[PDB]
């Protein structure tokens, strides 16, 4: 049961480079460990212009969700630190937006939730609630 009219969402786009690593979220699904590589490229469109306070207001008033264009990469298998296979997904946002998000905890939290949601629906995943920023590794895998 719910009554809200809007919710933040991934606007899936075709990845277009040049991409580069950003940061990596470790989490689990119902099936195993998952790494989400939040990457960025200038050729991913930005979200519509909005200030942090305008966006919080729209959330409070249920007048919009944050709609972030992002590519939702296909899975690639990678080894974790213990030598076990895990699934990684590369999710790219716009570079200007990424630079803004570096200076905002609020925008970062939105991106993480939205990337999780996009991958969950695209790949039929049930990510478990806990997740962690990888401190010493911006990207799980190569490139
Ligand atoms: Na809402």
Author numbering: 2 to 144
What does the paper say about this structure?
Engineered small non-antibody protein scaffolds are a promising alternative to antibodies and are especially attractive for use in protein therapeutics and diagnostics. We proved the applicability of this systematic procedure by selecting a monomeric single-domain human protein with a fold different from previously known scaffolds.
To generate ProBi-based binders to IL-10, we created a DNA library by randomization of 10 amino acids on one of the ProBi surface patches and used the ribosome display technique to screen for ProBi variants with the highest affinity. After the fourth selection round of ribosome display, we selected eight random colonies for two-step purification and crystallization trials. We started the crystallization with seven variants (G14, G21, H25, H33, J61, J70, and J93). Four variants created crystals with low diffraction quality (ranging 6 to 8 Å). Crystallization of the J61 variant resulted in crystals diffracting up to a high resolution (1.2 Å). The fold remains stable even after nine mutations at the selected positions.
